[PDB]
Design a protein around this nucleic acid. Structure first.
Ligand SMILES: [Zn+2]
Lengths: 167, 148, 490, 99, 99, 49, 718
RNA sequence: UAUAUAUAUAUAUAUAUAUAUAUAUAUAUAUAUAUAUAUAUAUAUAUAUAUA
RNA sequence: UAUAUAUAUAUAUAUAUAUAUAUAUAUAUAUAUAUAUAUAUAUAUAUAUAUA
């Protein structure tokens, strides 16, 4: 039967090391498992080559100017017979920034009762974030509506995360 | 269409139309130059242009090429049958219809539209050999055709 | 024979190709070497073929279709199966007493059908035959079906243009075979040095992984110059997906010629699938595929002669000067070109050197030259099988110092090929055998007086014959000797 | 200059009523003079010394016949072909590129 | 059809301003066609005869332009309406401003 | 013939030529029964072969 | 009545009961929905297009067709030759509706050369000296047309007169082809929408359906697709398939006025309650598939928040795979297994799909499934079905029932699909593991394995050269780096040619001459160089294999020999466009996945071939009973016994060349190859099968090896 | 030309069949609302058991 | 006092079944209108046969 609950921890095959996150396990496999100089060709230098290749992998980029270089393309008569997609119309909210709930407010039930009031208690969606700490972030077309859109967007996580990948 | 196919529009309210279908010459000039940059400047670039235009030309034209009247007017010339050379045969051996319906003619016309990119030249083989004399009849006929 | 595959010493790396165009891949501009030369040559020829109102002339179209039909043929059973498989109910004319396997018979069945419906049948089995030889392994006859022969038309056309417009087909026009006689005589004269070359097995060495893929890509690209929507020989234009750009893939129309290439490349990559049914052996028919080119008749000479010329030209002008050592050899190797120094037909080829001034080239340089050529052929898996003996071997003709030498052993007085367990012939045919037999003894210069005497004796025996009904009567007859005089015997 | 095209021959606007072969077009003039010149060549002394006059009489004859054929092409070049080019220039995927 | 078209015209008279009968678009000759093309000439004859039956106020102009179209070449008159030409399809005129 | 005469122009050409030929050969009285090479007989040659 | 013009996609199912289903099967889910559509698209028009396809350019064809009204009320009425045709007007005098003179009629009867006079002046007569558009222009008038040739386009073509005049003037199949048109008409109805394959002027009430897939290359009108698409694009007339399900049409996704949250939209709920006792108890050639958009997410941050994540589009995954696994939309399933690998069902979805792209753009990506990427995905959610249509499977990637070989790069997940999938059911016979051929089998056969021998030869080289080669292969920018890599390639080529080829050639029957073989290889060259008569399919999977094999550490080589071998095979492979391996998987396993959806039990079959007892005894075999022995070559499944028996009377024109050794290793060979399309599409075959005696107890002792030939005959079994 | 017979076409009438539309009745399906029953989940109360 | 399990009661949510109301679709029956086909009768026209 298909699983429905994520693993509580992740396991490497031989090191018996258990990890709370698969990312941590991934790094352990990425680094610690891969020195192992024991064969006729398991040299340290190739281990570095493999290690570099592992770190350098990214196969889900929209733009890839590195590999697009030297893509000499010949002019074709039929190719230019498409026309650009000019008509794109949106019925959603003309906005590109989102208010966030970066730190949720605590649910007090024994002491400090009444200091907090969630609109959910009245079955209402609040018009503003009601977290302990609220941030403004850039998430293009977060309220878009009507059709698919251009297909490339900018989405930044709250500053509690790295957000490095955007740059 | 050079004012052919004249047409007009009705006269009534058209509230919310939008037809973004146009651009300035500078845009066209820029695109044309860009188009010229993305090609191999050898014959490979020119050939599709000339070929396409030539096909369009042959597609729509009232002119019809037919050599029957010319030959009919040529073969009716009387000459002695006791001679060893009949220049009529020499002529008709030339002007050989290769069955391509004279692609060269339309090819030459199309080349004019893109003369700034490609030039049509007379084939080297279609020349009289420099070793010949004017009295060598095939050479003389060749020179005549080149002149024409 | 077909268990051989060429060994390439420097294969084209996979990274040397563009994105697919549905089946084919174009060659990256950055790639150089002989492959680049081959690619450009075929591409250029394809361009010239592309725009050519010589075709679409209805008369010319008739010539091509008519060229496909002969009294012989094969693979008819495979044809009937494949089309019946696809639900196509072909007509039959058995009461008209004509062999089904004849290429004529299958052609008649096809006449009504829309051509595109038949496309699935090109990937069908091909029968085979064998013809024995006097001084070598037996030859092979691999007749394609009419549909396959039709599809491969662009390959032939481009090859013809390459031949007729570069080195004038090296005598493959075959107008009268005697044009090679003065050629070899001149090639064997003292002032000239000649080298005999020939591909070890051109039929077995031409293949898709190296050769045909390049040709298919070049032809497909070479046909790009032309109306994308222009059916050719009933093959309409179609839509194919272009994946050259990983960021902007799409689909665009391609002309019928390109569609032919798309299927043709698919067939070549799949490899030919032959079915052997030898009668001399007992109950052992089977089928197995191979990359060996059919090469059953003169229709193959065009392709091999074109590739033969191309590789030789690149070797002379590029590879050899960059690689040879002797300065004198470089001096004489330059100022040399195929159109006035090299001829070929299929695998066979002749290379003659420019007249060394009142002198002859050092055998040392010759050895250096011949060695480098062997390595050059080894690069892309061609065993060149060259030799240097100051003689002329071309199309089985032998000349020594401008004198022709008839190799009589190749025409044995008693020997005759028979490719079937039964002779399957009737008595009067023996007369024609005698006539043909006598002429060889004239073509080859034998003692004309004694040869004539022997010939008449042969005629006398042949002059008489008989026959018996399967159950009934016998019959007999014989000719007066004056017949043979009329037939051409003094 | 934009929206203009150059043309190796002289040109005219499209005719009004029905067409017909003419003999004052530039091309027709070029043909006639060319033929006239070669006829003069054939009768030059250089040919007379070597070419039998009967054949010479024939050769000038056939050249004369060619000069008299009522072809339509010269008219078409001067009057109708430019229109076809002018229209098609707006149709081809690549606009004309002239010098 | 019991000549229903004929009766429709008469009926439309009593309801003009709510619905107008017009000469069917296909009835006109091709404006590029010449007067010599006899079927076109007969079409103009029919249109001219049937003109007054229709309730369209622009029928007079349309009838006139039909003949003018066929006579474009032999009778090159000037039409003082910007954006229009003697070769314009007759059925297109309509609005009074382009009379 | 159908395989040979894929189009119609060739068939029209051959038919016209054959019709004119026999008409001329008989009327001009050159001869009759002249087996002149013509496309209509090419399928016949194929069948015989 | 809004019209939607439709151009079929790559593998559009045509023999389907309703053309509508191949468009998007969701439209058939509700009666309230399916009642809103008409179809038209008649067969006679289809045949005409099939013919004219080879004789008109796209622009001409579009220009000709675009004016035709929806229900074609006109007919083309072929006239017989004048000598034949003239008699008709006198056989029925009132039929001389043009009233051609009797004198002229019998003058024609007398003439050796009956002229066209009988045709002359007949209104709307179309001589052979006419063109396609001439017909189409008259088609717009709706009245019937009289023609003098069969090659016509736009209207059904039927005889004007009884067949007696056309007989002799035409031949049997020609006389046959017009029969449906002789009584052509059928009504067309005024529902809300009407689909059509016939093009039309795009406008306010006509729309172009966009499916986001490649056209049917064989379909004659696919060439019109670019011009049509661009014209629609410039006026915003494209319709995504989902728009059809809404009550009112609009081009767009996520509209304001509709949440698009209804059972109709959920393509995963495939249901089949209705029945008609039809012979297709199931048509196992028609397969419903879906294109889905799935959102992928990584671990949350230290405060429970999560990154925006990325959504990708998976193409043409078979729907029954998801349904049988109880997959549901809007559920965030865990993506990663305990060991960090993907959960099996996701891998199956990827393997059987055609392509994976970024959701918005059209860039295809090869997904990684190892520990390479940082912040790797741990959760997956399917969001919506972009399309959901049935597709024809019969004989598409592979052609012969005998066997087929699939080539994949080293490191593919073939083990999962061949083991886990049948194990996930393990109740219905899918295949026999003894019949599937692992690509590594022959390499493992040599006494020192091919890998060991390659390693042993390889180490003789200087280590630095090897190190340089490995780095160059990994580093993409290292163009050629001839020295290091070429040296290794020479060793690889020399060894492989030396040892692998004869060993491969020695296993010929094992690859093909079994019941039904599924085989894997690292390159087509592995087979072509050995002359093995088996179809080879050059497949590809939408996952990065290089990184994948970099995680397999327990091998003979320390993960470095593997990449070397991988590069060598890829270099060895022939340059050609490879296909998605999912299509082949769909052809093989697809039909089986629909088994649990069935309502009635299956019925087994086979095509046993006889074996005379004489040769068996002559070969020293000890056998009881006189009746000839018979052997099961291949078993099949159906469910309607009635039609199944009705289809069992065909005599296959394919003999079997049975061969069996004394060790009871049994082999089969079909002298005429058995093609899959010849199998009636109501059947169902196992992925692999092994030939065996139908009754092993008949034999009492195996003598020597045996061979014989026999016919083939489908038969029932109990 | 006139009469009689037969065939075909057109018009009108009558009958029969089929299709489409509208009205009325009945049945079934789907959706929405309300009531009743059962199952599952969650919360609260009470009882009993076990652990702390 | 808290947690867990089991039983009972009450509340809320979801699913299924049944009843009632409203809307939509389909099928069947009856009535009316329109179209098409076939048969019969009458009239007119045309063709053919026979008689004068
Ligand atoms: Zn570990």
């Amino acid at each position: 039967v298909t699983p429905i609950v994520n693993p509580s921890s992740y396991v490497c095959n031989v090191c018996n090391a258990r990890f709370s996150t698969m990312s941590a396990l991934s790094e352990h496999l990425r680094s610690d498992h891969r020195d192992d100089a024991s064969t006729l060709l398991a040299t340290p230098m190739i281990n570095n080559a493999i290690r570099s290749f592992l770190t350098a992998w990214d196969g889900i980029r929209i733009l890839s100017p590195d590999v697009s270089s030297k893509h000499l393309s010949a002019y074709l008569d039929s190719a230019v017979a498409n026309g650009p997609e000019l008509i794109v119309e949106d019925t959603g909210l003309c906005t590109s920034f989102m208010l966030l709930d970066n730190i949720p407010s605590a649910h007090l039930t024994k002491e400090l009762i009444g200091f907090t009031w969630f609109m959910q208690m009245y079955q209402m969606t609040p018009p503003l974030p009601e977290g302990a700490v609220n941030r403004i972030v850039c998430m293009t077309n977060w309220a878009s509506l009507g059709d698919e859109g251009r297909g490339l967007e900018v989405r930044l996580p709250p500053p509690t995360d790295s957000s490095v990948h955007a740059y | 269409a050079n004012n052919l196919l004249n047409s007009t529009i009705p006269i009534s309210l058209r509230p919310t139309i939008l037809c973004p279908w146009f651009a300035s010459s500078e845009d066209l000039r820029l695109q044309q130059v860009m188009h010229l940059v993305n090609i191999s400047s050898n014959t490979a670039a020119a050939l599709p242009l000339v070929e396409a235009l030539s096909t369009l030309l042959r597609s729509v034209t009232p002119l019809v090429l037919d050599p029957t009247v010319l030959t009919n007017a040529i073969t009716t010339i009387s000459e002695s049958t006791t001679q060893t050379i009949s220049p009529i045969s020499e002529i008709l051996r030339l002007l050989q219809p290769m069955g391509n319906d004279y692609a060269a003619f339309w090819k030459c016309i199309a080349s004019w539209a893109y003369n700034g990119l490609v030039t049509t030249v007379l084939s080297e083989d279609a020349f009289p050999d420099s070793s010949q004399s004017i009295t060598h009849l095939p050479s003389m006929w060749k020179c005549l055709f080149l002149t024409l | 024979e077909y268990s051989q595959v060429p060994d390439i010493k420097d294969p084209i790396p996979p990274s040397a190709w563009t994105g697919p165009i549905g089946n084919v891949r174009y060659l990256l501009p950055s790639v150089q070497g002989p492959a680049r030369h081959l690619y450009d040559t075929w591409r250029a020829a394809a361009r010239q073929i592309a725009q050519d109102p010589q075709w679409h002339d209805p008369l010319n179209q008739a010539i091509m279709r008519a060229q496909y039909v002969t009294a012989r043929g094969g693979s008819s059973a495979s044809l009937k199966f494949a089309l019946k498989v696809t639900g196509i109910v072909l007509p039959e004319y058995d009461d008209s007493k004509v062999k089904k396997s004849s290429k004529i018979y299958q052609a008649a069945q096809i006449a009504r059908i829309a051509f595109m419906l038949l496309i699935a049948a090109i990937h069908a089995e091909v029968t085979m035959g064998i013809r024995n030889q006097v001084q070598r392994r037996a030859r092979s006859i691999m007749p394609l079906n009419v549909i396959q022969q039709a599809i491969s038309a662009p390959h032939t056309l481009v090859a013809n243009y390459i031949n007729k417009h570069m080195n004038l087909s090296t005598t493959s026009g075959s107008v009268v075979t005697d044009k090679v006689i003065p050629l070899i005589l001149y090639a064997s004269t003292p002032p000239n040095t000649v080298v005999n070359v020939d591909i070890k097995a051109c039929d077995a060495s031409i293949t898709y992984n190296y050769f045909l893929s390049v040709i298919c890509g070049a032809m497909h690209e070479g046909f790009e110059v032309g109306n994308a929507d222009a059916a050719f020989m009933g093959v309409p234009s179609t839509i194919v997906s272009d994946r050259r750009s990983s960021v902007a893939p799409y689909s665009r129309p391609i002309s019928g010629l390109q569609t032919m290439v798309q299927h043709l490349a698919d067939l070549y990559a799949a490899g030919f699938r032959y079915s052997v049914s030898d009668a001399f052996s007992s109950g052992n028919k089977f089928s197995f595929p191979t990359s060996t080119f059919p090469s059953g008749s003169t229709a193959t000479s065009t392709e091999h002669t074109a590739n033969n010329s191309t590789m030789m030209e690149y070797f002379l002008n590029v590879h050899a000067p960059s690689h040879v050592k002797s300065a004198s050899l470089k001096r004489i190797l330059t100022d040399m070109t195929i159109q006035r120094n090299y001829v070929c037909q299929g695998d066979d080829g002749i290379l003659l050197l420019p007249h060394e001034a009142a002198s002859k080239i050092s055998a040392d340089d010759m050895n250096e030259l011949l060695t480098c050529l062997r390595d050059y052929g080894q690069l892309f898996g061609w065993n060149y099988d060259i030799d240097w003996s100051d003689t002329a071997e071309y199309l089985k003709l032998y000349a020594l110092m401008g004198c022709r030498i008839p190799n009589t052993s190749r025409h044995p007085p008693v020997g005759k090929e028979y490719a079937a367990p039964q002779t399957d012939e009737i008595w009067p045919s023996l007369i024609d055998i005698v006539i043909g037999h006598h002429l060889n003894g004239v073509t080859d210069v034998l003692n004309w007086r004694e040869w004539l005497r022997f010939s008449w004796a042969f005629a006398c025996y042949s002059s008489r014959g008989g026959y018996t009904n399967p159950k009934g009567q016998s019959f007999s007859a014989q000719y007066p000797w004056w017949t043979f005089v009329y037939l051409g015997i003094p | 200059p934009p929206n203009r095209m150059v043309y190796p021959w002289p040109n005219q606007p499209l005719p009004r009523l029905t067409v017909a072969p003419t003999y004052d077009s530039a091309m027709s003039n070029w043909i006639s003079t060319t033929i006239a010149f070669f006829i003069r060549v054939v009768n030059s002394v250089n040919m007379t010394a070597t070419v039998n006059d009967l054949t010479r009489r024939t050769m000038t004859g056939v050249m004369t016949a060619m000069r008299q054929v009522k072809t339509m092409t010269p008219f078409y070049i001067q009057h109708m072909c430019p229109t076809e080019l002018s229209v098609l220039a707006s149709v081809t995927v690549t606009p004309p590129f002239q010098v | 059809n019991d000549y229903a078209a004929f009766w429709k015209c008469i009926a439309s008279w009593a309801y003009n301003g709510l619905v107008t009968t017009v000469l069917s678009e296909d009835a006109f000759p091709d404006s590029s066609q010449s007067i010599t093309h006899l079927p076109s000439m007969w079409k103009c004859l029919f249109l001219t005869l049937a003109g007054p039956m229709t309730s369209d106020p622009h029928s007079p102009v349309k009838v006139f332009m039909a003949l003018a179209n066929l006579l474009a070449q032999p009778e090159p008159i000037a039409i003082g309406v910007p954006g229009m030409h003697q070769t314009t399809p007759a059925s297109q005129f309509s609005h009074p401003g382009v009379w | 013939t159908e395989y040979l005469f894929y189009d119609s122009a060739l068939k029209a050409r051959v038919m016209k030529g054959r019709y004119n030929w026999e008409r001329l050969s008989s009327s001009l009285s050159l001869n009759v029964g002249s087996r002149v090479p013509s496309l209509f007989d090419v399928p016949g040659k194929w069948v015989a072969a | 009545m809004i019209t939607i013009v439709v151009i079929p996609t790559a593998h559009f199912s045509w023999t389907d009961t309703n053309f509508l289903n191949s468009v998007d099967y969701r439209l058939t889910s509700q009666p309230k929905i399916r009642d809103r559509f008409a179809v038209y698209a008649p067969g006679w028009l289809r045949r005409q297009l099939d013919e004219f396809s080879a004789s008109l350019t796209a622009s001409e064809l579009l220009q000709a067709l675009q004016t035709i009204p929806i229900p074609v009320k006109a007919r083309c009425l072929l006239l017989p030759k004048p000598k034949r045709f003239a008699q008709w007007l006198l056989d029925v005098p009132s039929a001389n509706i043009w009233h051609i003179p009797v004198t002229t009629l019998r003058a024609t009867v007398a003439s050796k050369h009956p002229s066209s006079d009988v045709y002359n002046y007949i209104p709307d007569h179309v001589p052979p000296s006419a063109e396609f558009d001439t017909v189409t222009r008259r088609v717009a008038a709706g009245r019937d047309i009289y023609v003098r040739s069969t090659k016509v386009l736009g209207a059904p073509l039927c005889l004007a007169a009884p067949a007696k005049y056309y007989a002799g003037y035409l031949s049997t199949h020609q006389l046959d082809g017009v029969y449906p048109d002789n009584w052509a008409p059928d009504n067309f109805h005024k529902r809300e929408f009407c689909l059509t394959i016939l093009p039309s002027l795009l406008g306010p009430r006509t729309f172009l359906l966009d499916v986001d897939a490649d056209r049917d290359a064989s379909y004659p009108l696919s060439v019109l697709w670019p011009q049509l698409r661009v014209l629609a694009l410039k006026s915003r007339l494209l319709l995504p398939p989902v728009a059809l399900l809404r009550r009112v049409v609009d081009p767009g996704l996520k509209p304001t006025w509709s949440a698009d949250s209804d059972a109709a939209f959920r393509a995963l709920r495939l249901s089949r309650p209705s029945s008609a006792s039809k012979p297709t108890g199931f048509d196992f050639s028609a397969l419903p598939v879906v294109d889905i958009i799935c959102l992928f997410e990584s671990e949350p941050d230290d405060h429970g928040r999560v990154a925006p994540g990325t959504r990708l589009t998976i193409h043409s995954v078979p729907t029954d795979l998801l349904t049988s696994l109880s997959i549901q939309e809007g559920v965030r399933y865990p993506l990663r297994q305990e060991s960090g690998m993907f959960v099996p069902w996701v891998l199956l979805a990827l393997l059987m799909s055609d392509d994976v792209t970024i959701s918005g753009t059209r860039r295809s990506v090869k997904l990684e499934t190892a520990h390479a990427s940082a912040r790797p995905f741990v959760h997956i959610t399917v969001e919506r079905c972009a399309s959901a249509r049935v597709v024809d499977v019969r004989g598409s990637p592979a052609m012969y029932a005998n066997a087929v070989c699939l080539t994949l790069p080293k490191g593919s997940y073939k083990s999962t699909i061949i083991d886990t999938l049948p194990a996930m059911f393990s109740d219905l016979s899918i295949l026999e593991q003894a019949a599937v051929i692992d690509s590594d089998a022959l390499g493992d056969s040599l006494r020192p394995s091919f890998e060991t021998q390659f390693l042993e030869r390889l180490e003789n080289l200087d280590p630095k050269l090897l190190d340089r080669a490995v780095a160059s292969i990994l580093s993409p920018a290292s163009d050629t780096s001839d020295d290091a890599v070429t040296t290794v390639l020479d060793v690889f080529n020399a060894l492989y040619r030396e040892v692998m080829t004869p060993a491969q050639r020695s296993r010929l029957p094992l690859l093909t001459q079994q019941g039904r073989v599924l085989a894997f290889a690292h390159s087509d060259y592995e087979l072509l160089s050995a002359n093995i008569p088996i179809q080879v399919v050059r497949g590809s999977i939408p996952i990065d294999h290089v990184v994948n094999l970099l995680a397999r550490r327990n091998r003979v080589g320390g993960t470095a020999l593997q990449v070397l071998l991988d590069y060598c095979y890829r270099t060895q492979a022939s340059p050609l466009a490879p296909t998605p391996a999912g299509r082949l998987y769909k052809q093989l396993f697809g039909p089986w996945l629909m088994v649990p959806r069935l309502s009635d039990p299956l019925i087994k079959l086979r095509l046993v071939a006889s074996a005379p007892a004489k040769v068996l005894r002559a070969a020293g075999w000890t056998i009881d009973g006189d009746p000839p022995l018979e052997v099961s070559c291949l078993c099949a499944y159906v469910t309607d016994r009635a039609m199944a028996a009705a289809l069992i009377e065909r005599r296959l024109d394919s003999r079997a060349l049975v061969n069996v050794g004394g060790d009871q290793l049994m082999f089969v060979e079909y002298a005429p190859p058995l093609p899959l399309v010849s199998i009636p599409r109501t059947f169902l075959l196992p992925v692999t099968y092994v030939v065996h005696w139908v009754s092993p107890q008949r034999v009492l002792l195996n003598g020597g090896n045996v061979s014989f030939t026999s016919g083939l005959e489908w038969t029932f079994d109990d």
